[PDB]
Amino acid sequence: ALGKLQDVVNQNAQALNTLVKQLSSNFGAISSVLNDILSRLDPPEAEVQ
Amino acid sequence: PTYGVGYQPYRVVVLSFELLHAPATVCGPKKSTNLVKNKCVNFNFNGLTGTGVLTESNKKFLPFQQFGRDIADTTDAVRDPQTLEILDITPCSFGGVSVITPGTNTSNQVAVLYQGVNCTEVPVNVFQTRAGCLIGAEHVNNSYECDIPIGAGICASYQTSQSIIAY
Amino acid sequence: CTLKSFTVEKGIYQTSNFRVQPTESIVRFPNITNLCPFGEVFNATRFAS
Amino acid sequence: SQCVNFTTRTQLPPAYTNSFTRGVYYPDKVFRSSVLHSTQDLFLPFFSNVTWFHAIHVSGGTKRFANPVLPFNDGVYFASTEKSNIIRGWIFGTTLDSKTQSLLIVNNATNVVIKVCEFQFCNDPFLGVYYHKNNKSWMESEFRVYSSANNCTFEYVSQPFLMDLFKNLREFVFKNIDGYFKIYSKHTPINLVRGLPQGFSALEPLVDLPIGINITRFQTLHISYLTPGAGAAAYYVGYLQPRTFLLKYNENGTITDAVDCALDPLSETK
Numbered sequence: 001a002l003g004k005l006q007d008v009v010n011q012n013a014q015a016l017n018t019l020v021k022q023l024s025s026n027f028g029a030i031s032s033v034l035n036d037i038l039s040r041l042d043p044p045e046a047e048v049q
Numbered sequence: 050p051t052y053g054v055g056y057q058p059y060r061v062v063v064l065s066f067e068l069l070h071a072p073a074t075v076c077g078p079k080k081s082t083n084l085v086k087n088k089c090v091n092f093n094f095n096g097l098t099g100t101g102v103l104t105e106s107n108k109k110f111l112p113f114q115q116f117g118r119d120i121a122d123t124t125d126a127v128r129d130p131q132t133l134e135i136l137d138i139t140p141c142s143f144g145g146v147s148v149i150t151p152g153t154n155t156s157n158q159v160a161v162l163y164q165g166v167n168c169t170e171v172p173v174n175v176f177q178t179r180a181g182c183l184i185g186a187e188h189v190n191n192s193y194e195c196d197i198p199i200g201a202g203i204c205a206s207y208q209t210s211q212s213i214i215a216y
Numbered sequence: 217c218t219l220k221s222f223t224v225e226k227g228i229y230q231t232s233n234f235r236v237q238p239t240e241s242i243v244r245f246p247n248i249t250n251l252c253p254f255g256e257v258f259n260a261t262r263f264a265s
Numbered sequence: 266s267q268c269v270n271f272t273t274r275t276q277l278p279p280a281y282t283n284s285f286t287r288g289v290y291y292p293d294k295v296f297r298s299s300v301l302h303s304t305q306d307l308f309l310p311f312f313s314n315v316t317w318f319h320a321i322h323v324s325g326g327t328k329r330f331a332n333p334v335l336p337f338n339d340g341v342y343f344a345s346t347e348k349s350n351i352i353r354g355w356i357f358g359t360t361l362d363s364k365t366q367s368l369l370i371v372n373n374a375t376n377v378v379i380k381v382c383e384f385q386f387c388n389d390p391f392l393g394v395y396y397h398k399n400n401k402s403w404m405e406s407e408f409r410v411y412s413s414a415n416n417c418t419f420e421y422v423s424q425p426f427l428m429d430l431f432k433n434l435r436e437f438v439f440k441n442i443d444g445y446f447k448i449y450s451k452h453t454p455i456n457l458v459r460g461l462p463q464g465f466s467a468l469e470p471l472v473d474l475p476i477g478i479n480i481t482r483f484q485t486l487h488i489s490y491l492t493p494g495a496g497a498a499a500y501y502v503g504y505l506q507p508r509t510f511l512l513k514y515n516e517n518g519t520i521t522d523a524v525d526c527a528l529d530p531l532s533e534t535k
């Protein structure tokens with residue numbers, strides 16, 4: 001019966017999860033971790049990624 | 050033994066470093082600093098870098114496991130490589146900073162709300178509500194109508210010398 | 217500054233974002249995996265030709 | 266050592282069985298609690314045709330029954346059902362000769378020896394243990410596996426121990442990826458008399474080694490009990506494939522259950 005509310009909650013949570021998981025996507029860069037790029041490549045190389 | 054230094058024996062050791070396109074097997078002494086707990090620090094465990102608060106944990110890590118993740122896949126726990134004890138990682142305290150201000154036409158005195166942060170991580174008339182830490186508001190037991198809604202049922206109004214009172 | 221105004225009306229205005237940037241850095245690595253036997257070479261009683 | 270030659274060589278025919286839902290191993294050293302996680306890795310697909318045979322450890326009686334040489338592909342799941350530790354080691358490589366580097370992973374009575382060298386394996390690798398009547402205990406006294414071993418590339422000897430010379434099921438998973446040879450192992454007390462038992466059990470990581478060699482075939486090594494003069498151990502082999510799995514970690518971080526997405530539409534929905 002409470003589905004109307006429950007779904008709402010779930011939906012919001014779902015979005016957040018997706019948002020958070022978007023931090024683990026490379027998008028074409030060498031890696032999704034910014035610290036790894038900074039510490040492994042020089043700024044001239046880093047900026048491109 | 051009586052020869053000149055040029056004709057005396059000399060023991061020579063040459064250290065060469067073979068670096069191939071294969072996983073390495075020899076590393077120099079790993080520089081490990083003393084462990085720090087209950088304070089936002091920039092930690093690094095076996096190459097896993099991060100920033101957070103390291104605290105003693107009750108989690109029952111398996112012997113072979115070195116890290117602990119969550120739904121976000123972010124490092125929620127770690128294992129100290131030297132001493133095999135588990136540490137929980139908490140995000141370094143952060144949050145919005147808002148300003149409860151009665152109209153400047155009324156007064157220039159303002160209170161500052163740090164949203165969702167305990168009243169311990171602020172540098173430095175301090176109220177700890179569920180909304181966050183409110184600094185510059187005098188907590189009042191008397192209850193009036195809501196004037197400037199801070200949140201969690203707490204509203205702050207400028208009233209009687211006059212100051213900002215949260216209730 | 218946030219309001220781009222000189223008159224601020226009564227309210228609560230989200231102005232900034234407060235962070236607690238760490239005081240120090242901590243590095244923890246496995247102290248011992250196996251002792252490289254340099255003493256067996258340097259401290260060898262007899263050397264080869 | 267010097268190879269022992271057998272005039273008569275034979276090998277029993279293979280048989281097939283259903284893998285049920287075994288072969289799940291922890292993909293990473295991460296700890297996850299009371300969650301479900303989807304991983305794309307080299308797993309043993311549920312209900313896969315598994316090729317199993319028997320390894321004879323006693324002669325009674327001049328016929329040498331030799332194990333077969335099986336491909337390696339991208340990894341192999343190897344189960345052994347036995348009372349005593351009959352299966353002792355494995356040999357991996359492409360040519361299994363001095364021409365190319367070969368790996369030997371054995372668990373002798375003393376310790377576990379792992380050697381990556383240009384081995385020249387014997388035609389019929391032999392390990393022989395004789396019963397010491399005075400000491401009332403078996404003692405290994407013959408080891409003739411490879412004729413030669415040159416240009417060794419890796420060596421690792423575990424600490425000495427005493428191996429004991431109601432069945433035991435020892436599951437192993439060998440995976441060669443990115444120049445790393447990963448071995449996962451699990452040991453369970455199984456009361457079944459014959460056949461691969463049906464059930465689920467995760468495999469804890471045993472050891473990963475940076476051998477960095479190419480492997481395409483391997484073979485099993487059994488122990489022989491020399492007697493003055495029937496319960497032969499059995500072993501099953503399956504081949505890992507790139508599969509998507511949904512693993513369920515309980516509160517204690519243990520993989521209680523797993524679901525194979527590509528098995529059936531219901532699992533795809535799951």
Ligand SMILES: *[C@@H]1O[C@H](CO)[C@@H](O)[C@H](O)[C@H]1NC(C)=O
Pocket residue numbers: 131132133247248
């Ligand atoms: C390395 O750390 C372990 C962890 O307790 C300790 O037992 C050992 O003595 C340490 N060895 C050295 C050489 O510091």
Ligand SMILES: *[C@@H]1O[C@H](CO)[C@@H](O)[C@H](O)[C@H]1NC(C)=O
Pocket residue numbers: 154155
């Ligand atoms: C300040 O506010 C009061 C009432 O709140 C109003 O009467 C007065 O005109 C205001 N002053 C200015 C300068 O706007």
Ligand SMILES: *[C@@H]1O[C@H](CO)[C@@H](O)[C@H](O)[C@H]1NC(C)=O
Pocket residue numbers: 167168169177
């Ligand atoms: C703030 O920290 C103190 C001590 O660490 C704790 O007792 C208190 O409950 C915390 N505040 C909140 C709102 O949890």
Ligand SMILES: *[C@@H]1O[C@H](CO)[C@@H](O)[C@H](O)[C@H]1NC(C)=O
Pocket residue numbers: 188189190
């Ligand atoms: C408000 O009342 C509570 C109990 O009713 C008391 O403990 C607290 O000290 C009061 N606060 C002030 C500011 O008087």
Ligand SMILES: *[C@@H]1O[C@H](CO)[C@@H](O)[C@H](O)[C@H]1NC(C)=O
Pocket residue numbers: 254255258259
């Ligand atoms: C060689 O041995 C001496 C004592 O026998 C010791 O003081 C020295 O540190 C050793 N050198 C090395 C390289 O281990």
Ligand SMILES: *[C@@H]1O[C@H](CO)[C@@H](O)[C@H](O)[C@H]1NC(C)=O
Pocket residue numbers: 281283314
């Ligand atoms: C396994 O293979 C054999 C012959 O290769 C076949 O008869 C059998 O049906 C297969 N198993 C399954 C479950 O299909």
Ligand SMILES: *[C@@H]1O[C@H](CO)[C@@H](O)[C@H](O)[C@H]1NC(C)=O
Pocket residue numbers: 109516517
């Ligand atoms: C998890 O492990 C602890 C270790 O003692 C045990 O007490 C507990 O029962 C385990 N949890 C479950 C659900 O079995």
